[PDB]
């Protein structure tokens, strides 16, 4: 069940029941990026918001329509715009954007709006009945970024540390710490033994496999 704005620059996929997967285009040669809608009994929560204040209030507007319910979070996975793209509309619509204090700090060193800073190393969040997972695992696609573990799905949003299944280029190293990433991916594996899906930045959702691949691009 996929839903797109008449563009086709906005998608909505479900991954299951409440988990659905939300992926926008941004231009410069058209770019996908990924991230999660989460339906709970209390309001929708989203992980990461788009590539601008455009995309974003428009993301808002198609799941705010679909599940007739308003997005409260949003946790930003790192300081980049196609996460923290749209951080003006969620402040202004009154959505708690969750990042740890690094990457809000970075936000402010890149020109968007700051976060909340709020989560810690591991931090454990629970909309309604709806359960997060947030964990810091090191540095690598960029200096701040987190992963999101969904435990009662076992569904992990690796982001941009996890490459996609045909993707053979790390994409932006100018701000990555590509030695350290290696380590930061294992401390996902370390932590997370029973993964299902695995949710890329950019591309299709894939598994485990998806981890190994990265590291492999990286040896
Ligand atoms: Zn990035």
């Known amino acids: 069940t996929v839903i797109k704005n008449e563009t086709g620059t906005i998608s909505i996929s479900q991954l299951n029941k409440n988990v659905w997967v939300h992926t926008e285009l941004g231009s410069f040669e058209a770019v996908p990026s990924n991230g999660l809608v989460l339906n709970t009994s209390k309001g929708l929560v989203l992980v990461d918001s788009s590539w601008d ?19 409260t979070d949003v946790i930003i996975t790192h300081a980049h715009a196609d996460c923290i793209g749209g951080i003006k509309t969620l402040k202004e619509r009154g959505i708690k954007a969750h990042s740890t204090a690094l990457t809000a700090e970075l936000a402010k ?60 280029d790390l994409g932006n190293v100018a701000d990555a710490y590509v030695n350290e990433w290696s380590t930061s991916i294992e401390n996902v594996l370390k932590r997370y033994r029973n993964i299902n899906a695995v949710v890329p930045g950019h591309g299709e959702v894939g598994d485990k496999g998806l981890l190994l691949h990265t590291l492999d691009l990286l040896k």
Not at 53 to 71: A, G, H, N, S, Y
Not at 142 to 154: A, S
Request: glycine share 8%; with cysteine; aromatic share 8%.
């Open 53 to 71: 204040d455009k995309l974003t209030k428009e993301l808002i507007e198609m799941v705010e329509k679909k599940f007739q319910k308003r997005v």
């Open 109 to 168: 060193k890149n020109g968007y709006e700051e976060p909340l800073g709020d989560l810690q190393t591991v931090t454990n969040l629970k909309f309604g009945n709806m359960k997060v997972e947030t964990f810091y695992p090191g540095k690598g696609h960029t200096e701040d970024n987190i992963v999101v573990w969904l435990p009662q799905y076992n569904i992990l949003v690796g982001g941009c540390l996890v490459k996609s299944t045909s993707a053979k």
